Amino acid sequence: PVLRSVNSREPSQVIFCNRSPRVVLPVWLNFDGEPQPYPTLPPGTGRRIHSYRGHLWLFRDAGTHDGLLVNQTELFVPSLNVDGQPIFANITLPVYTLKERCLQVVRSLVKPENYRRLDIVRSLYEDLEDHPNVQKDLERLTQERIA
Amino acid sequence: AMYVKLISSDGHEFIVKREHALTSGTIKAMLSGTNEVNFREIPSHVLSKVCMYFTYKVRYTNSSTEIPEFPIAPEIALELLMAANFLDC
Amino acid sequence: MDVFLMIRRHKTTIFTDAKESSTVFELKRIVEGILKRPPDEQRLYKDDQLLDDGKTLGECGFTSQTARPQAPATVGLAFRADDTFEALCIEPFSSPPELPDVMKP
Amino acid sequence: MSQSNRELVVDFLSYKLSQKGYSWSQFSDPMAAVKQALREAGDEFELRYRRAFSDLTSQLHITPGTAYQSFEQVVNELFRDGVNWGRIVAFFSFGGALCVESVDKEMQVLVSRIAAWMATYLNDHLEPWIQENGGWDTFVELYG
């Protein structure tokens, strides 16, 4: 288990800030390395939450599981609070590729049973079917530990 | 800066900044192989949306501003998907 | 503050940006550099309203909430022709095909 | 039957001590079916929940003066939401881990004390539930 929260038990006040148009699902990687879902954040809303130093957080579209960014990066690690003011985790849309954005919009209109009834190249069937998930993203982030 | 002319299949001329058009690797290859590119099978209602994506990516990439959604209507999503797959952007 | 535009005449569309405090005349200079015709031979329109060279792009209605990078505002363009002017003519884009059934609710 | 529970405590502690190289004889002093069943269950719990051992090792400043206070806190939070068979073998696995670490940190004086702490808690706060749930024979069937 490479990507997991550190069981520091050191509290850390964090403000989850949803600066995106998506309903954001905060995802916490537990001490065992598994992702756990947390209450969702409507667009524009933000909650002050209790986390711990060294824990790991991902942020996803609560419905389509599209990847979002937190503080311009993919993972969020809370730190100890200076001057009693919380840490801000600003969740925003990444600038998707036009292809991926197109795949998003088509995925939200065609049921997966009907991907093959669309008139496109067969490589676009396999692209429409490779939904974004948390697990595949984790395997990429773990294998990027090399240097 | 410099501009390039992207011509749609129905004859519409789109004049965009060259840096913005170079977002697509295909356009960068068509230009490098003079300042015009003709798209024989990309209609104007799709190529216009592609040009909007160029000005959208250059503005918001590496920018720390709150990024808004790039909108795609359902009537254009299927053709814009095919165009983006060809242009690689 | 920047505004993002589509300067359109006939089958020509120019994708450009400008400051909201930038004037209509200054936008004509941008058109002059690209299409090689001076501002005195240009008429810029917002919809069907003639824009004075002295007004800023914001005072015409092109703000950051209406002239966005992913949804630019459209500015019409007409050139002078002999002793008179040509009329504003923006040829529309193509139409998308009918929405396929698998994409309908 | 009361001190039949004491026999389990001594048996399980001797078992976890001999896995580390220590004998129970150096520190103090069917029924075989429940000992073997509780032996194998403690090892399986130790394999399935290795992080609980690591987390507890790094949190308990273990000291002979404060070892009883640390033992009662751990056991009381272990049975906070009631007792079940799995927690009972975790209770045994905890005392085994407490013993083996006491020998590692050269505090062997606590090996006999721990066995009495476990036997006392087992008779006072666990035997009512065990006999109400069919005795240790129920535990052996559930494990096999």
Author numbering:
A (entry chain A): 61 to 207
B (entry chain C): 16 to 48, 57 to 112
C (entry chain B): 1 to 105
D (entry chain D): 1 to 29, 82 to 196
Task: Copy text from the publication.
Overexpression of BCL-xL and BCL-2 play key roles in tumorigenesis and cancer drug resistance. PROTACs are heterobifunctional molecules comprising two different ligands connected via an intervening linker. The ligands are specific for an E3 ligase and the target POI, and formation of an E3/PROTAC/POI ternary complex leads to K48-polyUb formation and proteasomal degradation of the POI which otherwise would not be targeted for ubiquitination by the E3 ligase. 753b is a VHL-based PROTAC and we were interested in elucidating the molecular basis by which 753b induces targeted degradation of BCL-xL/BCL-2 through formation of VHL/753b/BCL-xL and VHL/753b/BCL-2 ternary complexes, respectively. For our structural studies, a complex of VHL, Elongin C, and Elongin B (hereafter referred to as VCB) was used as the E3 substrate receptor subcomplex, as VHL is unstable when expressed alone.
